[PDB]
Symmetry: D2
Subunit: 381 residues, 4 copies
C-alpha cells in the first residue's frame, strides 16, 4: 500500500487540504488527514496538484488515432486498448466505447469484442454504448408503438447481452414503448438521441424507461416557444441525466450555462470525441464520411462541423473558464454524475474507502500530472 | 375602511386573521384584526384571497378596443375603457401599446397619455411604444417625454447602441423584442441599457445548440426582466417552467391581449398555478411586485404595505374575481 | 380491474387532466388518457379531487389513540393495525413505526412484532424505525470511534434483523464509524438525530454511511456563525435526505423555506406524531413523561412543547399555505422523496405502471375523499 | 492607454483577446485587441485576471489606522491612508465605519467626509455610521446629510419604524446589525425600509428551529443584501455556502477589517473560490457588482464597461495583486 499526499484532494463531495488517499490492492483504502496515516507508509507527493476521481466519458467514438466504428478490423479489442491509453493521458480512466451503426454483424462483433475485452481489463472501458439502429437520421408506418418483427429480434439480442451493453441511444418517436421498457428492465441505460421528438413524444419515452439523453441540443430539434422538443423536455424533466459536449463548438457556452442551472446534478461532461483527440490526425472516416481535422475543428468536405476532438481535461477546463461553473462542480460533472447515470457509483466516481483506485491529478492550469488505474500509475508528467 | 376575513397576500407573505385598512386612496396599515380601531367599517372578504392589483406591462387591447388599428382610437376614452375592462379581471394597472412608425401619431399618444395621467392617477401608467425599429429627431423627442413613456420595444440588431443608451438614461425601459437578434447582438443591446424583453420566446429566434439567439441570451442574463404570455397557447408550459427557473424574480406575467391573445391577468395567474408548478405566492409576485419593479413603480405599487396606493383585487380559491379596488374605491363587486 | 377518472391526477412527476389510473391485482396497471381506456371498463369518478400516491410517513411514534412505545402491551401487532387505519383517514398509506427506547427486551419485541405484522400486511407499515439507544439525550469515555462490547452485540442484532428494520436514528458523535458502516451495509438507513454533533462530527457520520437526518432542527444544535452543527451540516450536504415536522410549532416556517431551498428533492415531510393525531386524547404517556393535548399542542406539565399531533394531509396543507411550496412539490415531499430516502421507490412513491396501488385523493381544501391500499378503497368521504 | 494580454472580467463575463481602453479617468471601451486604435499605448497584463476594483462596504480600519479608537483619527488623512492600504489588496472603494454615540463626532465625520469627497472622487464613497441604536434631532440631521452618509447600521428592535423609514427615503442604506432581533422584529425592520444587513451571522442571534432570528430572516428575505466575512474564522465556510445559495446575487464580500479581522478583499476572493465552491466569476461579482448595487453606485462602478469609472485591479491565478488602478491611474505595480 501507498499514500498520495501534499496536494488538494477532491473526494467528489469536498476539497481537502493536508489529507491523504491510501491505496492498496487496487482500491482506495482510506481518505484521512496526513497525521492519521500509518507510521512509515510510503508517501508519494502530489506536488501541489489537484487529485480527482478519474474522469468517466460516457460517449466516445474514437481517440488516439483510432475509432471503434465503421470496419470489422477497427471494432476490436486492440482499438479499445488504444483508446484507454490515450484517454489516460487526458485524465480519463473510464469510458463507454460508442459504436454508431445499423449493421447487425458489426453490432454482434462489437458485443463479442466488448466481452473479450472486459475479461482481460477490469475498471477501464466499462461497456458498450450502442447508438443504433433506431435513429431518426438527420431527417424525420406504425403508430410507432407497434413492435415490428426485426425490431423484436434485435431487442431480444440486446437484452441477452445486457451484461456488456451499458447504454443504447435511440430516438423515442421511432420505437415502441415496449422496447424501451424491455431494455431498461434488462439493466441497459436507454438514452434519447438523434431524434426529432416533440416534447410529448419525449415524455412518453421517459415514462417507458429512458433515463438519459445523448449530447443535449445536438441532433435534437431546436427549441421554439410553442414546441420545446426533446431538448426542452430534457431540461424540464428533473430525473433525466444528460451528456453535453463542452468544446465551445457544438454548444454555445450560454446554452451550457442554462442547461447546468436547469439540470443541476444531472448534467454530465462528455467528449463525443473521434480519432483526432489525443493524436495528430489530419483526416479520417466516420459513419461513412470523410472528416478533416483543421484545427480546433472536425469538418466535412462542405466545412460543416462533423465531429469532436475534445478530451475530458479540456472539457473540465472549458466548463470552469467559460461557463462560470465552480471547479468542484465541474469535477462532479466528469466523475460522480456520469457514474451515477450509468449505475457504477458503488465502485467509481468518488474518492472514498472501498472504491476502485482510478484517479487523476492535474495542475491549476489543467495539465495532467498523474493518472492511476486500478492503483497503478500509468501516466506520470 | 378595513378589508377582513380572508387570506391577505402582501407580496412577501400570506397573512391570516389580519386586515388591510384603507384611507384616502392609500393603504394606511396591514395589521392583526385585534389591533383594528373601534367602529371602523369592516368589509368582509368572505374567505377570498386579497392581492395587490395586477399590473400588465404588455397589453394591445381589451374591452373591445385597441389603442391602435384605426386613428381615433388613440384617446383618453380608449384608455378609460381598457382600465374598466382590466378591473373585471383583477388588473388595476397597465401600459397600453402604441404600434406605429408615424412620428405625428407618437406625438399624439404622448399628449393623450399626459392628459389621461392628470385625470386618472395610478391606473394606465404610461405608454408602451412598439416601433418603429422592429425586425434622430425621434430619439430626443422620446427622451424629452420620458415622464409619460414607460417602455419602448425595439430590435437591438436594428439600432446603434447610443440610441438605446440615450433612451435608458432618460428613464425609459428599453425592451428587446420583435427581433431576430443573435446572442452576441442581444448581449450588445443589454450592455447598451436594455433591461427588459417583450414576451419571451414570441417574435424572437428559436434556440439552437450553436445559436441561443435573443431568447437564450435573456435566459442567461440574470438582470434582464421579461414578460411571458401564460395562455398555454403562445408558450408551451414546459418552456414557461424552464424560463421561471432561469429568470427567478425577473419573470413577469403579461397577457399581450387584444392569432392574438384573449388572456386576462386572473386567467394567467390560474394557468401558472395549475399548469406550471409555481406556487401561488410566487405567481402573485409575477403579476404584481415583479412588473412593478421592472418599470420602476415599486415605491407606490406592487405590495400591500403602509403608504402604498390602495390598488387591490380579491379572488376565490377557484380564481374568480370578487373585488377590485382602485385608489381605495371598489370598482368591481362580484 | 377498474379506473379512477374525472379529477386531477398527480403521478409524482406531473399533474394530468382528462386522464385515468387503471388498477388491477393491487397494482397500478397504467396511467393514460381517458380515451385510451378499454371499452366498458368500470370508471369510478374522482369528482374533481386531486389523486396522489398515498403519503408515506417515515417518523411516527403513535396516532389514533395508540403508541408503538413504552410498554410491552403497546408494542404489538394490534397497535400497528390501529395506526395504519388512523393514518389512512389522513391519506397516509405507509409508515415506519418509530420505537424510541434504550431497552433491549422492548427492542427485540418490536423486531418480532414488526416481522409478524409484515407477514400479514404487505405494503402498509413498512419496517421499524428504531431511535435508540445511541442518543445524546438532550444533554452532551472513548475517542468515541472505539466499539464497546455491548455496542458490538447490539449492532450485530440489528444487522441480523435488517429485513424488518428500515431505519436506525443515532447520534454520530456517540457511535463508532464502524457501527454506522455495518448498519448501512446491511441495508438499514442510518439517520443522524438526537445529537449534539459539530459540523465535523456530522460529516464523519455521513462519510461512514449516514444518509438521513431525523427531524431537521429539532434535537440538534442550534446554528451559529462559527459552529454550524449537525443542522448546518445537513443543509450543506446535498446527498443527505431529511425529515421535517411541518406543524408550524416545531419549526418556524421561514426555517422550513430555507431548508427546502437548500435541500431540494431531499426534504421529506414527516409528522413525528403521537397518540392524539387522528384521535381525541387529552393526556398520554410518552418515553416516560405525561403529555397533555391542549389543543393544537402536545405539552408537558411545564408547558414545554413535547410531541406532534400532525397528520400527513395537514402537513401537506401547511407546506402549501404557509411555506410557498407548490402543491406538486409538496406532494413529492410526502411521497416520492421519502420513498427514495428509504429505498422503496420501485414499488411506491409514484403513480405509474407496475407500482403498488396505494393512493389518496383530496379536495382543493385538503379534505381526504379516498384512500386506496393494495387497490382496495379503505376510506370513502 | 489600453490594458491587454490577460483575462478581462467585465462583471458579466470573462473575455479573452480583448482590451480595456482607458481615458480621462474612465473606461472608454472594452473591445477585441484587433479593434484597437493604431499607436495607442498597450500595457500588458502578463496573463493576469483584470477585475473592477474591489468595493468593501464594511471596513473599520486598515493600514495601521481606524476612523475611530481616539479622537483625531476622524480626518481626511485617515481616509487617504486607508485608501492607499486598500489599493495594495485590490480594493479601490470602501465605506469607513464611524462607531459613536456622540452627535458632535458624527457631525465631524460628515464634514470630513464631505471634504474628502471634493478632494478624492471615486475612492472612500461615504460614511458608514454604526451607532448609536445598537443592542430625534439626530434622525433629521442624518437625513439632511444623506448625500455623504451611505450606510447606517442599527438594531431594528431598538428603533421605531418611522426612524428607519425616514433614513431610507432620504437615500441612506439602512442595515440591520448588532441586534438581538427575532424574525418578527427583523421582518418589521425590513418592511420599514431596511435593505441591508451587516456581516451575516456575526453579532446576530443564533438560528434555532423555533426562532430563526435576524440571520434566518435575512436568509429568507430575497430582497435583502448583506455582507459576509470570508476569513474562515468569523463564519464557518459551510455557513457561507448555505448563505450564498439562499442569498444569490445579494451576498457581498466584506472584510470588517481592523478578535478583529485582518482579512483583505483579495484574500476573501481567494478564500471564497478555494473553500466555498463559488465560481471565480461569481466571487468577483460578490466583491464588485453586488456591493455596488447594494449602495446605489452601480451607474459608475462595479463593472468594466464604456463610461464607467476606471477603477480596476489585476491579479495572478494565485491571487497576488499585480495592478491597481484608480480614476485611470496605476497606483500599485507588482
Amino acid at each position: 500500500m501507498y499514500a498520495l499526499t501534499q496536494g488538494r484532494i477532491f473526494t467528489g463531495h469536498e476539497f481537502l487540504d493536508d489529507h491523504a488517499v491510501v491505496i492498496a490492492d487496487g482500491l482506495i483504502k482510506s481518505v484521512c488527514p496526513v497525521a492519521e496515516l500509518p507510521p512509515e507508509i510510503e508517501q508519494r507527493s502530489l506536488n501541489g496538484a489537484i487529485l480527482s476521481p478519474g474522469f468517466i466519458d460516457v460517449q466516445l467514438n474514437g481517440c488516439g488515432g483510432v475509432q471503434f466504428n465503421d470496419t470489422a478490423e477497427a471494432v476490436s479489442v486492440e482499438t479499445l486498448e488504444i483508446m484507454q491509453k490515450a484517454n489516460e493521458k487526458s485524465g480519463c480512466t473510464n469510458y463507454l466505447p460508442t459504436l454508431i451503426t445499423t449493421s447487425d454483424e458489426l453490432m454482434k462483433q462489437g458485443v463479442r469484442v466488448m466481452r473479450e475485452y472486459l475479461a482481460k481489463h477490469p475498471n477501464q472501458a466499462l461497456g458498450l454504448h450502442l447508438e443504433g439502429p433506431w435513429l431518426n437520421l438527420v431527417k424525420k408506418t406504425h403508430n410507432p408503438n407497434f413492435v415490428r418483427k426485426p425490431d423484436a429480434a434485435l431487442v431480444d439480442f440486446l437484452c441477452e447481452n445486457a451484461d456488456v451493453i451499458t447504454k443504447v441511444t435511440l430516438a423515442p418517436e421511432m420505437v415502441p414503448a415496449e422496447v424501451i421498457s424491455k431494455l431498461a428492465n434488462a439493466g441497459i441505460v436507454v438514452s434519447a438521441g438523434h431524434s426529432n421528438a416533440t416534447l410529448k413524444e419525449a415524455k412518453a419515452g421517459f415514462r417507458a424507461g429512458i433515463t438519459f439523453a445523448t449530447h443535449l441540443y445536438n441532433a435534437m430539434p431546436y427549441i421554439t416557444g410553442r414546441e420545446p422538443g426533446l431538448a426542452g423536455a430534457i431540461l424540464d424533466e428533473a430525473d433525466i441525466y444528460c451528456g453535453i459536449i463542452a468544446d465551445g463548438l457544438h454548444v454555445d457556452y450560454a446554452n451550457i450555462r442554462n442547461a447546468k442551472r436547469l439540470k443541476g446534478d444531472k448534467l454530465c461532461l462528455v467528449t463525443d470525441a473521434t480519432a483526432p483527440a489525443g493524436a495528430n490526425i489530419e483526416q479520417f472516416i466516420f459513419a461513412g464520411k470523410t472528416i478533416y481535422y483543421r484545427n480546433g475543428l472536425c469538418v466535412d468536405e462542405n466545412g460543416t462541423l462533423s465531429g469532436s476532438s475534445l478530451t475530458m481535461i479540456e472539457g473540465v477546463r472549458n466548463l470552469v473558464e467559460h461557463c462560470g461553473i465552480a471547479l468542484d462542480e465541474v469535477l462532479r460533472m466528469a466523475t460522480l454524475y456520469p457514474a451515477r447515470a450509468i449505475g457504477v457509483e458503488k465502485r467509481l466516481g468518488t474518492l472514498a474507502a472501498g472504491k476502485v483506485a482510478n484517479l487523476t491529478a492535474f495542475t491549476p492550469d489543467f495539465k495532467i500530472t498523474k493518472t492511476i488505474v486500478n492503483g497503478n500509475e500509468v501516466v506520470t508528467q
